[PDB]
Write a structure and sequence with these properties.
The structure is cut from a larger assembly and holds eight protein chains of eight kinds.
Chain A (H helix, E strand, L loop, with lengths): L12 E4 L7 H7 L8 E3 L4 H8 L4 H15 L1
Antiparallel strand pairs in A: 1-2
Chain F lengths: L3 H26 L1
Chain G lengths: L5 H25 L3
Classes of the chains: A mainly alpha, B mainly alpha, C mainly alpha, D alpha+beta, E alpha+beta, F mainly alpha, G mainly alpha, H mainly alpha.
The structure holds chlorophyll A (6 copies), 1,2-distearoyl-monogalactosyl-diglyceride (LMG), the ligand CC1=C(C#C/C(C)=C/C=C/C(C)=C/C=C/C=C(C)/C=C/C=C(\C)C#CC2=C(C)C[C@@H](O)CC2(C)C)C(C)(C)C[C@H](O)C1, the ligand CC1=C(C#C/C(C)=C/C=C/C(C)=C/C=C/C=C(C)/C=C/C=C(C)/C=C/C2=C(C)CCCC2(C)C)C(C)(C)C[C@H](O)C1, the ligand CC1=CCCC(C)(C)[C@H]1/C=C/C(C)=C/C=C/C(C)=C/C=C/C=C(C)/C=C/C=C(C)/C=C/C1=C(C)CCCC1(C)C (2 copies) and iron/sulfur cluster (SF4) (2 copies).
Chain lengths: 73, 173, 92, 80, 137, 30, 33, 147
C-alpha cells in the first residue's frame, strides 16, 4: 500500500524474517522497506506485476490469495 | 463402529497402536480438553485478580535471547511467558507419562495386541461416579465446550477469557 | 592380571620404583643454567612444585621453568619406565 | 539377482566359466558348435555382476550377457 | 558331506574374518587336502600355514572361498578343494565341485539353464514387450 | 491492515486444502 | 492473541516439530516388515 | 605373544588384544550397566540416563547462546531436556522398528526390554540434568570452573 504511492523509491518487501539465530545487528540490518521488523526485499517483481494488473490495497491481494486457496482445494 | 473399522483398515499403523480415531484417542483428548477448560478458568481468575506478576512487562531480548522477540517486531509479555512455562510443566509431565507410564495408569500408545475399548456410541451408560463412562461424557462435553468457546470468542469478538467469564456469570471477575 | 585373553602379566610396582630411581638419581646432576637454577632436574622439579603450591590456584606462568622441567623429567622417566619393563619382562 | 544368459553364438571356449570368480557358469553338452559344449548359468543366484564372463568372451558381441537386476546380499558381495 | 572336525590352517587371527552376518545368514567353508605344510595367503588378508592332510577353513563369502580355491589350484597343485555353505540351522550344503568335476569341463548330467536359441541381435524391443508378459528373448 | 479474522479465514481454507491433499495422496498411493 | 505472535508460534513448529515427526514416521515406515 | 585369535577362533573378524581382551577391559565392560548382570533393562536405562544428562547440562550452560546471561543455567537445563526428549524419541523409534513383538524375557534385545530401557533412560536423564542444575545453581565452584 505504501509502495503503490512511490514505487520508484520504496523497496518491495517479500516477507518478514523470524530467525531466532539473528543478533540485534542482523535484525537492525534487515529492518528496511519502511517496516519495523526484519524483512526480505522481493526480487520476483510480483509488486510491479500486481500493480499493473490493478491491485492497489492489501485486501485485493488477500482476496486473490483466498481465491487461489479455494482453487487449490 | 463402521468408521472405526474402516480407519483400522486404512491406517493399520495408527489404529493398531491406538492412535488416530479410536476410543482411546477420544478418552485421552477428553481428558486433555477437561484439563484445558480448567486451565482457562484458572487463567481467567488469575488475570482478573492481577495475580500474574508484571503481566504487561515485555521480556528483554538482551536477557532472554532472540526467542523473546515476537513475529512482527513485537515482544512477548511476561504474562504470556509465564503461561507458556506453566504449560511446559505439564508438557514435561506428559512426555514422562507417555514414555514411562505408571503401572496402573492408562497408556497413550497401546500395545500391538491390545483390545480396543467398546465404542460407547451416542452416550455411554449414565454411571454416576469416578467411572469410565462419566469420564467419557465429561470429556466429550469439555471438547465440545472448547470448540464452542473458541467460536463464540471469534464471532462475538470477545476474548476467550471474556466469553468464559460471561458464561460463568462474571463470578471469576 | 591378564594383559590379553589368556596371557598373564606380573605388573610389578618394584619395576616402576626402580625405573623412577634410575631416571631421578641422574637427574640430581646440578647445572648452573637459569632453567635449573643451580640444582639438578629432579630437585628443580621439586622446588617448582613447592613454589607453585605456595601459590596454589595460579598455574605456573607460560615461560616459567616449571613446564620445561616437567616435560624433560617426565620424558626421561617414561623412557626409563619403558626400558625397565622391557628388561624385567624380556630379560628378567 | 542378476540375469545371466547364453546365446547360440557360443563356441564352447569355456573361458567364461574359467573367469567367473563365483561358480555361476558351467559347461554342458551341445551340438551347435564344433567343441560340442555350451555355457549355462544354473547358479545365477550367486552372480555378483562383475562381468568377468563377459570380458572373457571371444565372439562378436558376447555369447554370454549379464543383465544387472535386483540386488541381494550375495549379488552385492556383502561379507557383513 | 562335510566333517566339522577337520583341523584348520593354524591361522594367527585377523580382522578380515567373518562377522555377525555369518552367524545370522550364511557361512561358507572350504576343505582341502595338502601333501605338506605350506604357507598360503588368506583371502581376507595375512598369511596362514596349511597342514599336512585335511584342512578346513571358514569364510563369509563364496567368492572368498573360490579365490582361496583358485590360489590352491594355481599357486600350489591342490585341486581337491570342496566348498560348502552353512546356515544357522546347520544345514550344510555342497556347492563348488557340485557334480564332483569342475565346471570348466563338460560332464554328462548337466541341464542347460539360461540358454537362448538366437543371437543377441534377435532380441525383441521394449516397445514390443511393453504392457505384456513377453520376454525380450 | 490484514486482520486476525482474515488470517483465520485463510488458515481455515488452508486446513480444508490440507484435508483434500491428504485424500488425494491416499488415492494416488493406492 | 494477535497475528504478530503467529511467526513465533509457527516457525519452531514447522522447522523442528513437523520435520521431527515426519522423519520419525518415515523412518518407521521405511524400516517396517 | 600378547595378540591372539579371538575366542581361539582364527577366522572370526576380530583379534584378541590387550585393549580388547585384557582383565581390566573385561572387568570394566562387564561391570558397566549395559552389561552388568542382574539389572533389568529399566535399571540399565536409569543408570545410563542419570550419567548422561548430568554431563549434558554443562556444555549448554557454559557455551549456549544465553551463556553470558542471568538465565544461562536454566537455558542450559531446558536445552538438555529438549535433547533428552529427542534422544528418547530416537530410542523409541529404534525399539519399535528393530525389535519385533516376540518375547525373549526382557533381555534388552526385545520390544519390552527396549521399551523399559528407553523409559528408564528418559527418567534418569531428566533426573540427572535436574541434579546437575541444582548443584551448579547452589555451588559457586561449578559456576566458575574454579576461578
Ligand atoms: C491443542 C490441543 C490439543 C492437545 C493438547 C492434544 C493432545 C493430544 N492429542 Mg490431539 N487433537 C487436537 C488438539 C489437541 N490434542 C485437535 C483439535 C484434534 C482434532 C479433533 C486432535 C485430534 C487427535 C487425535 C485423532 C489423536 C490425538 C492424540 C493426541 C495425543 C497425542 C498427540 C501428539 O503426540 O501430538 C504431538 C504433536 C505436537 C505438535 C506437540 C508435541 C510436543 C512434545 C513436547 C514433543 C515430544 C513428542 C514425543 C517425544 C513423540 C515423538 C514421536 C516421533 C519421534 C515419532 C495428545 C493427548 C492421539 C491420542 O490420543 O492417541 C492416544 C490421537 O490419536 N489428537
Ligand atoms: C528451522 C528451525 C529451527 C528453529 C526454530 C531453531 C531454534 C533454535 N535454535 Mg537452531 N538450528 C536449526 C534450525 C532451527 N533452530 C538447524 C537446522 C540447525 C543445524 C545447523 C540448528 C542448529 C542450532 C544450534 C547449534 C543451536 C541452535 C539454537 C537454537 C535456539 C536459538 C538460540 C537460543 O538462545 O535458544 C536457546 C535457548 C533455549 C532456552 C533453548 C530451549 C529449546 C527447547 C528445549 C526446545 C524444545 C525441543 C522439543 C521438546 C523437541 C521435540 C522433538 C520432536 C520433534 C521429536 C532455538 C531453540 C541454540 C541453542 O541453544 O539450542 C539449544 C544452539 O546452540 N540451533
Ligand atoms: C545456524 C544457521 C542457521 C539456521 C539454523 C537458520 C534458520 C532459519 N533461517 Mg536463517 N540465516 C542464517 C543462518 C541460519 N538460519 C544466516 C547466517 C543468515 C544471514 C544473516 C540467515 C538469514 C535468514 C533470513 C533472511 C531468513 C532466514 C530464515 C530462517 C528460518 C527459516 C524458516 C523455516 O523454518 O523454514 C523451514 C525450512 C525450509 C522451508 C527449508 C527447507 C530446505 C530443505 C533442504 C528441504 C527438504 C525437502 C525434503 C525432500 C522433504 C522434507 C523432509 C522433512 C519434512 C523431514 C530458520 C529459523 C527465514 C525466516 O525467518 O523465515 C521465517 C528468513 O527469511 N535466515
Ligand atoms: C500443550 C499441550 C499439552 C498440555 C497442556 C497437556 C496437559 C496434560 N497432559 Mg499431556 N500430552 C501432550 C500435550 C499436552 N498435555 C502431548 C503432545 C502428549 C503426547 C505425548 C501428551 C500425553 C499425555 C499423557 C499420556 C498424559 C498426559 C497428562 C497430562 C496432564 C499433566 C498434568 C496433570 O496431570 O495435572 C493434573 C494432575 C495433577 C496436578 C496431579 C495434563 C492434562 C497425564 C495425565 O492426564 O495425568 C493426570 C498423562 O497421563 N499428557
Ligand atoms: C633408560 C634406561 C635403560 C636402558 C637404556 C637399558 C638398557 C638395557 N637393559 Mg635395562 N633396565 C632398566 C633400564 C634401562 N635398561 C631398568 C630400569 C631395569 C630394572 C627393571 C632394567 C633391567 C634390566 C635387566 C634385568 C637387563 C637389562 C638389560 C638391558 C639391555 C637390554 C636391551 C635393551 O634394553 O636395548 C636398549 C638399548 C639401546 C642401545 C637402545 C638405544 C635407544 C636410544 C636411546 C634411542 C640394555 C643394555 C639386559 C642386559 O644386561 O643386557 C646386557 C638385562 O638382562 N635391563
Ligand atoms: C506455498 C506457499 C507458502 C510458503 C512458501 C510459505 C512460507 C512461509 N510461511 Mg506461510 N502461508 C501460506 C503459504 C506459504 N507460506 C499461506 C497460503 C498462508 C495462509 C494460510 C500462510 C500463512 C502463514 C502464517 C500465518 C505464517 C506463515 C509463515 C511462513 C514462514 C515459515 C513457515 C511457516 O510457519 O509456515 C506455516 C504455514 C501454515 C501454518 C499454513 C500454510 C501452509 C501452506 C499452505 C503449505 C503449502 C505446501 C505446498 C503447496 C506444497 C509443499 C511441497 C512439498 C514438496 C514440501 C515462511 C516464509 C510464518 C512466519 O514466520 O512468517 C514470517 C507465519 O507466521 N505462513
Ligand atoms: C508415511 C511416512 C511419512 C510421509 C509423510 C510425508 C509428508 C512430507 C512431505 C512429503 C513430500 C511428498 C512425498 C510423500 C511421499 C509419501 C510416501 C509414502 O509412503 O506415503 C504414504 C502415505 C499413505 O500411506 C499410508 O500407508 C499405510 C500403511 O502404513 C496404508 O498403506 C495406507 O493405505 C496409506 O495411505 O502417503 C500419503 O498419504 C502422503 C500424503 C500427501 C502429503 C500430505 C501433504 C504434506 C505436505 C506438508 C503439509 C504442510 C504441513 C504444514
Ligand atoms: C482447551 C485447552 C487445552 C486443550 C485441549 C484440547 C485437547 C482440546 C481438544 C479439542 C478437540 C479434540 C475437539 C474436537 C471437537 C470435535 C467436534 C466438535 C465434532 C463435532 C461433530 C459433529 C457436530 C458432528 C456430526 C455429525 C452429525 C451431525 C451426526 C453424525 O451421524 C455424523 C456427523 C459426524 C457428521 C489444553 C490442554 C491445550 C490446555 C489449554 O490451556 C486449554
Ligand atoms: C477440577 C480439577 C480438574 C478437573 C477437571 C475436570 C473434570 C474438568 C471438567 C470440565 C468440563 C467437563 C467442562 C465442560 C465444559 C462444557 C462446555 C463449555 C459446554 C458448552 C456447550 C454448549 C455451548 C452447547 C451448545 C448446544 C446447546 C446448548 C444446545 C444444542 C446445540 C448447541 C447450541 C450447540 C483437573 C483435571 C484440571 C485437575 C485439578 O487438580 C482438579
Ligand atoms: C484458524 C481457526 C479459526 C477458528 C477455528 C479453527 C479451530 C479452525 C482455527 C484453527 C485453525 C488451524 C489450526 C488451521 C491449521 C492450518 C493448517 C494445518 C494449514 C496447512 C495447510 C497445508 C496445505 C494446504 C498443504 C498442501 C499440500 C499439498 C497440496 C501437497 C501435495 C501433494 C504432495 C506433496 C505429495 C503427493 C500428494 C499431494 C497431495 C498431491
Ligand atoms: C577416562 C578417564 C581418564 C582420566 C581420568 C578421568 C577421571 C578424567 C577419567 C574419565 C572420567 C569420566 C569421563 C567421568 C565422568 C563422569 C560422569 C559423567 C558422571 C555422572 C554422574 C551422574 C550423577 C551423579 C547423576 C545423578 C543423578 C541423580 C541423583 C538424579 C536423581 C533423580 C532421578 C534420576 C529421577 C527423579 C528425580 C531425581 C530424584 C532428582
Ligand atoms: S566364452 Fe562366450 S563363447 Fe566361450 S564359452 Fe563362455 S560363452 Fe560360450
Ligand atoms: S558376472 Fe561375475 S559372477 Fe555373474 S557370471 Fe559373469 S562372472 Fe560369474
Amino acid at each position: 500500500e505504501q509502495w503503490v504511492l512511490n514505487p520508484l523509491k520504496v523497496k518491495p518487501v517479500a516477507h518478514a524474517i523470524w530467525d531466532p539465530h539473528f543478533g540485534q545487528p542482523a535484525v537492525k540490518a534487515f529492518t528496511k522497506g519502511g517496516v519495523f521488523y526484519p524483512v526480505n526485499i522481493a526480487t520476483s517483481g510480483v509488486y510491479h506485476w500486481w500493480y499493473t494488473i490493478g491491485m492497489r490495497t492489501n485486501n485485493d491481494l488477500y482476496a486473490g490469495s483466498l481465491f487461489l486457496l479455494f482453487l487449490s482445494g | 463402529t463402521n468408521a472405526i473399522e474402516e480407519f483400522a483398515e486404512s491406517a493399520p499403523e495408527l489404529a493398531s497402536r491406538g492412535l488416530g480415531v479410536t476410543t482411546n484417542a477420544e478418552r485421552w483428548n477428553g481428558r486433555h480438553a477437561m484439563f484445558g477448560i480448567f486451565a482457562i478458568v484458572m487463567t481467567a481468575y488469575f488475570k482478573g485478580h492481577g495475580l500474574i506478576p508484571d503481566a504487561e512487562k515485555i521480556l528483554d531480548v538482551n536477557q532472554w535471547g532472540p526467542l523473546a522477540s515476537a513475529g512482527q517486531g513485537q515482544g512477548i509479555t511476561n504474562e504470556r511467558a509465564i503461561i507458556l512455562i506453566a504449560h511446559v510443566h505439564v508438557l514435561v509431565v506428559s512426555v514422562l507419562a507417555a514414555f514411562a507410564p505408571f503401572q496402573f495408569q492408562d497408556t497413550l500408545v497401546k500395545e500391538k495386541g491390545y483390545t480396543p475399548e467398546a465404542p460407547a456410541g451416542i452416550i455411554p451408560p449414565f454411571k454416576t461416579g469416578l467411572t469410565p463412562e462419566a469420564e467419557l461424557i465429561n470429556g466429550r462435553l469439555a471438547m465440545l465446550g472448547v470448540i464452542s468457546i473458541i467460536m463464540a470468542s471469534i464471532f462475538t469478538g470477545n476474548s476467550v477469557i471474556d466469553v468464559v467469564n460471561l458464561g460463568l456469570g462474571k463470578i471469576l471477575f | 592380571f591378564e594383559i590379553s585373553d589368556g596371557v598373564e602379566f606380573d605388573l610389578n610396582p618394584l619395576v616402576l620404583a626402580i625405573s623412577f630411581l634410575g631416571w631421578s638419581l641422574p637427574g640430581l646432576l646440578p647445572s648452573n643454567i637459569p632453567l635449573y637454577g643451580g640444582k639438578g632436574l629432579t630437585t628443580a622439579l621439586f622446588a617448582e612444585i613447592g613454589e607453585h603450591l605456595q601459590t596454589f590456584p595460579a598455574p605456573p606462568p607460560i615461560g616459567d621453568p616449571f613446564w620445561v622441567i616437567l616435560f624433560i623429567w617426565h620424558s626421561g622417566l617414561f623412557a626409563t619406565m619403558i626400558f625397565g619393563t622391557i628388561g624385567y619382562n624380556g630379560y628378567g | 539377482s542378476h540375469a545371466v544368459k547364453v546365446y547360440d553364438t557360443c563356441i564352447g571356449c569355456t573361458q567364461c566359466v574359467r573367469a567367473c570368480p563365483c561358480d555361476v557358469l558351467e559347461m554342458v553338452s551341445w551340438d551347435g558348435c564344433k567343441a560340442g559344449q555350451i555355457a549355462s548359468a544354473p547358479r545365477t543366484e550367486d552372480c555378483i555382476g562383475c562381468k568377468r564372463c563377459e570380458t572373457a568372451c571371444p565372439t562378436d558381441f558376447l555369447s554370454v550377457r549379464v543383465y544387472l537386476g535386483g540386488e541381494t546380499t550375495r549379488s552385492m558381495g556383502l561379507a557383513y | 558331506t562335510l566333517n566339522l572336525q577337520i583341523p584348520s590352517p593354524t591361522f594367527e587371527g585377523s580382522t578380515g574374518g567373518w562377522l555377525r552376518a555369518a552367524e545370522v545368514e550364511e557361512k561358507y567353508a572350504i576343505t582341502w587336502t595338502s601333501g605338506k605344510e605350506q604357507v598360503f595367503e588368506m583371502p581376507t588378508g595375512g598369511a596362514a600355514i596349511m597342514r599336512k592332510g585335511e584342512n578346513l577353513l571358514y569364510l563369509a563369502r563364496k567368492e572368498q572361498c573360490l579365490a582361496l580355491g583358485t590360489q590352491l589350484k594355481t599357486g600350489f597343485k591342490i585341486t581337491d578343494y570342496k566348498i560348502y555353505r552353512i546356515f544357522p540351522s546347520g544345514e550344510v550344503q555342497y556347492l563348488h565341485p557340485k557334480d564332483g568335476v569342475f565346471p570348466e569341463k563338460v560332464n554328462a548330467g548337466r541341464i542347460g539353464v539360461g540358454n537362448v536359441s538366437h543371437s543377441i541381435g534377435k532380441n525383441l524391443n521394449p516397445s514390443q514387450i511393453k504392457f505384456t508378459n513377453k520376454s525380450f528373448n | 491492515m490484514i486482520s486476525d479474522t482474515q488470517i483465520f479465514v485463510a488458515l481455515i481454507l488452508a486446513l480444508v486444502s490440507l484435508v483434500l491433499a491428504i485424500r488425494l495422496g491416499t488415492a494416488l498411493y493406492q | 492473541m494477535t497475528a504478530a505472535y503467529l511467526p513465533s508460534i509457527l516457525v519452531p513448529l514447522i522447522g523442528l516439530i513437523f520435520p521431527g515427526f515426519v522423519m520419525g514416521f518415515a523412518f518407521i515406515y521405511i524400516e517396517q516388515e | 605373544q600378547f595378540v591372539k585369535p579371538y575366542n581361539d577362533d582364527p577366522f572370526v573378524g576380530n583379534l584378541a588384544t590387550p585393549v580388547s581382551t585384557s582383565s581390566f577391559t573385561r572387568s570394566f565392560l562387564s561391570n558397566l550397566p549395559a552389561y552388568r548382570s542382574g539389572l533389568s533393562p529399566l535399571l540399565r536405562g536409569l543408570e545410563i540416563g542419570m550419567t548422561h544428562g548430568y554431563f549434558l547440562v554443562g556444555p549448554f550452560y557454559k557455551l549456549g547462546p544465553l551463556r553470558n546471561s542471568d538465565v544461562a543455567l536454566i537455558s542450559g537445563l531446558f536445552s538438555s531436556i529438549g535433547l533428552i526428549i529427542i534422544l528418547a524419541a530416537c530410542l523409541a523409534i529404534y525399539g519399535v522398528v528393530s525389535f519385533n513383538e516376540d518375547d525373549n524375557t526382557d533381555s534388552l534385545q526385545t520390544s519390552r526390554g527396549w521399551k523399559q530401557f528407553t523409559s528408564g533412560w528418559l527418567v534418569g536423564s531428566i533426573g540427572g540434568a535436574s541434579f546437575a542444575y541444582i548443584l551448579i545453581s547452589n555451588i559457586v565452584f561449578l559456576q566458575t570452573s574454579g576461578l
